[PDB]
Amino acid sequence: TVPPFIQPFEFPRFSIGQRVFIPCVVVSGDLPITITWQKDGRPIPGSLGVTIDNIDFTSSLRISNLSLMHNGNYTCIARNEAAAVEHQSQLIVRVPPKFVVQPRDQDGIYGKAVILNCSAEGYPVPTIVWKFSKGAGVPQFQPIALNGRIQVLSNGSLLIKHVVEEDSGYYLCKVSNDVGADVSKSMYLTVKIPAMITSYPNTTLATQGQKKEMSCTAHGEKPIIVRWEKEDRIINPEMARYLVSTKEVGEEVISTLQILPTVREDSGFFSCHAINSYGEDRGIIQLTVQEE
Ligand SMILES: *[C@@H]1O[C@H](CO)[C@@H](O[C@@H]2O[C@H](CO)[C@H](O)[C@H](O[C@]3(C(=O)O)C[C@H](O)[C@@H](NC(C)=O)[C@H]([C@H](O)[C@H](O)CO)O3)[C@H]2O)[C@H](O)[C@H]1NC(C)=O
Ligand SMILES: *[C@@H]1O[C@H](CO)[C@@H](O[C@@H]2O[C@H](CO)[C@H](O)[C@H](O)[C@H]2O)[C@H](O)[C@H]1NC(C)=O
Ligand SMILES: *[C@@H]1O[C@H](CO)[C@@H](O[C@@H]2O[C@H](CO)[C@H](O)[C@H](O)[C@H]2O)[C@H](O)[C@H]1NC(C)=O
Ligand SMILES: *[C@@H]1O[C@H](CO)[C@@H](O)[C@H](O)[C@H]1NC(C)=O
Ligand SMILES: [Ca+2]
C-alpha cells in the first residue's frame, strides 16, 4: 500500500581524512523495508572501508578515514512489497596540491637524456610548471624553453632529451589546481662531461735535430688521463727523446708531447687519448719531419 520515501540527502563538502556518516532515512512506507546502497551503479566493494549501519528504517554509510577512493555517486535504494525508490548524491573530496616529497639533486651526463621527477599530490590532478636558474649563483628563476629537446611529461616529470652544459643549474616545480597552489624546493642539476679532446693541430711540421712540441686540449670531469700513441704504440715515459707534460688552464687540461731532438722516423700519426669515468675521446696529429 504505502510506498517507501527517502528523506532527500546531499553530501556536504568534505576534507580529506575526515570522518563521514551519511544516513538514508526511509521516513514513510509500509514495513518491512529493505535498504541497500550502490556506488557508481555497483555494490560497494569491501576494499573501500565503508561500514553500513542498518537501523530499523535507516541505512548509514560510515567512513573512519575519507580518501580519494571514496569519490563517486552513491545510491540509496528502499524497497517494500509496494514499490522501490532511489536517492543519489555525489561524494566529492578535493586534495590541495601538496609537495610531501621534494625533487632531489641529480647528475645529468652531457649528450644523454635526464628526467627531473616532480610528483605532487592533489585532486583534481594539479597542472605542473617548471622554472630554471642557469648555474650555481643566487637563483633567479625564469620560465623554461619547451622546443622538442625539453618536454614536460604526463606525470609532470621534466625530460631533457640531450643534456648540454647550459642545462646545469637550479630547477623547481610549481603545482596548482582549483583548491590551491604550491612551489617545490629547487633541486640542482649537475651536468657530467665525458672526456673530450677539444683542440689540436691536424698536421704539423718539424725539422730533424730540432725540438718539436704538439699539444692537445682535453675537457671533462676529473680525474682525466691523457695518453699519447705513435702508430698504436703507447708513448711510455721511459722513451728516450719523448716527454709528455700536462698543465691545467681553468677546467681544461693541456697535454704536450715534446720530441727533442726530432728524427725523420718520428714522422706519422700521433694520437692523444683522454679518458674519465664518463667517456673517452681522441685527436690525431700528422707529424712530418723535414731535413736539417
Ligand atoms: C682538425 O682538428 C679539429 C680539432 O682541433 C677538428 O675539429 C672538429 O671537427 C669536428 C667535425 O669535423 C667537430 O666539428 C668538432 O667540434 C665540436 C662538435 O663535435 O660538434 C663542437 C662541439 O661544441 C664540441 N662539444 C663540446 C665542447 O662539448 C665538440 C667536442 O669538443 C669533441 O669531443 C671534439 O673531439 O667539438 C671539431 O672540434 C677538425 O675536423 C680537424 N680537421 C681536419 C682537416 O682533420
Ligand atoms: C556522478 O554523477 C555526476 C552527475 O551528477 C557525473 O558528472 C557529470 O557527468 C557528465 C558526463 O556524463 C559530465 O562529466 C558533467 O560535466 C558532470 O557534471 C559524474 O560523472 C558521475 N560520476 C561517476 C559515475 O563516477
Ligand atoms: C615520470 O615519467 C616517466 C615515464 O616516461 C618515468 O620514466 C621513464 O622510465 C622508463 C622505464 O624504462 C625509462 O627509464 C624512460 O627513459 C624514462 O623516461 C619517470 O620515472 C616518472 N616519474 C616518476 C616519479 O614516477
Ligand atoms: C625518478 O622516478 C623514477 C620512477 O619511480 C625513479 O625510479 C627514479 O630513480 C627517480 N629519480 C630520482 C628521484 O632521482
Ligand atoms: Ca538507478
Author numbering: 594 to 885
Paper quotes:
Down syndrome cell-adhesion molecule (DSCAM) is a cell-surface glycoprotein with an extensive ectodomain consisting of ten immunoglobulin domains and six fibronectin domains. To further characterize the portion of the ectodomain of human DSCAM that interacts with netrin, we produced a truncated fragment consisting of immunoglobulin domains Ig7, Ig8 and Ig9. Wild-type-derived rod-shaped crystals were obtained of significant size and good morphology, but X-ray diffraction screening on the microfocus beamline P14 only resulted in diffraction patterns to ∼8 Å resolution. GD-derived crystals from the initial condition diffracted to 2.5 Å resolution and further optimization of the conditions resulted in a complete data set from a single crystal at 1.85 Å resolution. The crystal structure of human DSCAMIg7–Ig9 contains one molecule in the asymmetric unit. The fragment corresponds to three immunoglobulin (Ig)-type C2 domains, each consisting of two layers of antiparallel β-sheets held together by a conserved disulfide bond. Clear electron density for the glycan chains was observed in all three Ig domains at residues Asn666, Asn710, Asn748 and Asn795. The predicted glycan at Asn658 was not observed in the electron density. An analysis of the buried surface areas of all of the contacts occurring in the crystal lattice reveals that the most extensive protein interface is formed between Ig7 and a symmetry-related Ig7 domain (830 Å2). When this protein interface is compared with the Ig7–Ig7 interface observed in available Drosophila DSCAM crystal structures, it is remarkably similar. We conclude therefore that the rigidity of the glycan stub substantially contributes to crystal formation, but without disrupting the biologically relevant dimerization of the receptor fragment.
